[PDB]
């Protein structure tokens with residue numbers, strides 16, 4: 385009587401007094417134990433949960449607190465110490481990530497079988513970017529493409545803190561510099577990152593900022 | 599007569615694609631003096 | 632009378648399992664001069 | 665007439681998502697002294 389009811393993140397299906405499907409909050413107790421350490425998530429408070437589920441089903445039956453307003457899901461992994469982003473490293477960084485983007489892209493060009501991962505246009509900027517048994521003339525697209533992926537709620541040319549999650553979270557525990565690098569991109573401190581903020585952050589002159597690449 | 603109950607849910611999906619290759623390793627220590 | 636046809640195909644199977652971590656990053660760049 | 669037999673199973677679910685990203689590669693070697 386239930387299979388056909390899908391409830392939002394945090395809720396499950398339980399039958400009401402008339403046997404008719406409804407949605408209530410989940411018993412955190414009843415989620416899959418982490419298949420490893422990766423399945424765990426950290427929290428604003430250096431406080432570990434066993435999985436995504438475990439954070440939802442906790443947070444689900446919540447709302448409108450002030451000690452909870454300053455509490456949000458910080459990143460994947462369990463809660464570990466994160467060393468300070470030294471200035472030496474925080475510089476050496478955009479150069480590493482942007483490279484990593486290049487690869488991230490290229491490692492997609494391969495998997496993409498029918499525009500499911502890259503359009504055709506892109507697949508052909510990567511083509512012209514791959515073929516290089518030869519430096520700056522590559523990163524341009526990556527960075528953009530990345531920004532594309534993020535700015536989406538809502539698409540406006542700016543990057544909300546929440547819009548970063550999907551990159552900040554899975555990344556912090558492999559790159560202590562991450563949290564730092566993203567707040568010191570927002571030059572003007574608009575608490576948002578605009579394409580300009582975001583391109584110049586990765587060492588990309590404003591003459592290459594082609595707002596059509598997102 | 600009545601058409602019997604819908605089939606059962608099918609086969610689980612395949613395994614996913616492997617994640618993305620990590621960041622390139624940090625910088626190198628500046629050579630001896 | 633004798634039984635009638637067999638019900639329709641059931642639901643799509645569920646999502647597959649997540650792939651494995653990704654090849655380690657390439658080697659870091661030497662600590663120049 | 666009674667209800668027929670249940671039908672085929674639903675088509676196979678969808679390939680699971682990718683996996684976490686990889687570890688940062690190894691620290692680069694030292695250079696000019």
Ligand SMILES: *[C@@H]1O[C@H](CO)[C@@H](O[C@@H]2O[C@H](CO)[C@@H](O)[C@H](O)[C@H]2NC(C)=O)[C@H](O)[C@H]1NC(C)=O
Nearest residue numbers: 426427428429430431432462463464465466467
């Ligand atoms: C958050 O909690 C973690 C782990 O519970 C703390 O990391 C530990 O630091 C101590 C050193 O004082 C070690 O003995 C533990 O083994 C560490 N755990 C790890 C990462 O394996 C960390 O100090 C806390 N960070 C804060 C306060 O945000």
Ligand SMILES: [Ca+2]
Nearest residue numbers: 535538540542
């Ligand atoms: Ca936006």
